[PDB]
Structure 1
Amino acid sequence: VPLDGGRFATSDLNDLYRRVINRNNRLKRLLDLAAPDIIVRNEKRMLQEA
C-alpha cells in the first residue's frame, strides 16, 4: 500500500520474495557465463538460504 510519505508500507514477503528473485536471477547469469565452481557454489548456497 502506498503511504502518505511516499515510502510504501510493505509486507515482509515482498522483501523476502525479492531477496530470492535477485539471487535466482543472479544464478541464471552464471549458468550462462559458465562461471567457475567456487562462485556458483556460493551463489547456489545463497539461493538455498534465501
Structure 2
Amino acid sequence: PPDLRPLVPLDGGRFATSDLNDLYRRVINRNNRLKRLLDLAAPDIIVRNEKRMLQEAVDALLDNGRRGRAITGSNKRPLKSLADMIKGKQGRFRQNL
C-alpha cells in the first residue's frame, strides 16, 4: 500500500524516493518493455534476455543482494528490498515489535 511506502515531502522539487518505490518503478519498466516486445513478435534472443532482465529485477524487488551484485542506488548505497525491512536488527521485529 502507498501509505506504507510514502515519499519524503521535503522543501523542494527533488525527492529522496524510497528504495521500494524505485524498485517497483524498475519492475514496471522492465515489464511494460516485455509486454510490448511480445506483441511485436521480437526475436527470441531479445525476449530471452529481457525475461532474464525481468527475472533479475523481481529478485532485487523481493530480496536484493542475495543472488549476486546488489543493485545499488545512485552511485554506491545499496537499496532496501522487501526482505531487508523484515530481516536484520532494523526489521519490524527487532525494531518495532
TM band (smaller chain)? 0.7 to 0.9
Segments of 5+ residues of structure 2 without an aligned counterpart are 1-7, 57-97
Aligned match of 1:34: 41
**DSSP 3-state at the match of 2:15:** coil
Greater CA deviation, 24-33 or 6-15?
Answer: 6-15
1:5 shift after superposition: 2.1
User: How far apart, CA to CA, are the structure 1 residues paired with 2:9 and 2:43?
Assistant: 42
User: How far apart, CA to CA, are the structure 2 residues paired with 1:31 and 1:2?
Assistant: 39
Segments of 5+ residues of structure 1 without an aligned counterpart are none
User: How far apart, CA to CA, are the structure 1 residues paired with 2:16 and 2:30?
Assistant: 24
Percent of counterpart pairs with the same letter? 100
**DSSP 3-state at the match of 1:43:** helix
Given the two structures, how large is their TM-score scaled by the length of structure 1? 0.87
Q: RMSD over aligned Cα, in angstroms?
A: 1.0
Given the two structures, how large is their TM-score scaled by the length of structure 2? 0.48
Q: Higher RCO, 1 or 2 (CA under 8 Å, sep at least 6)? A: 1
Q: Give the number of equivalent residue pairs.
A: 49
**Which structure: greater helix fraction?**
1
**1:43 aligns to 2:50 (yes or no):** yes
Greater CA deviation, 31-40 or 8-17?
Answer: 8-17
Q: Which runs of 4+ in 1 moved over 2 A?
A: none
1:6-50, Cα deviation, whole Å (9 max, x unpaired): 11232100000101000110000111000000000111000000x
User: How far apart, CA to CA, are the structure 1 residues paired with 2:38 and 2:9?
Assistant: 37
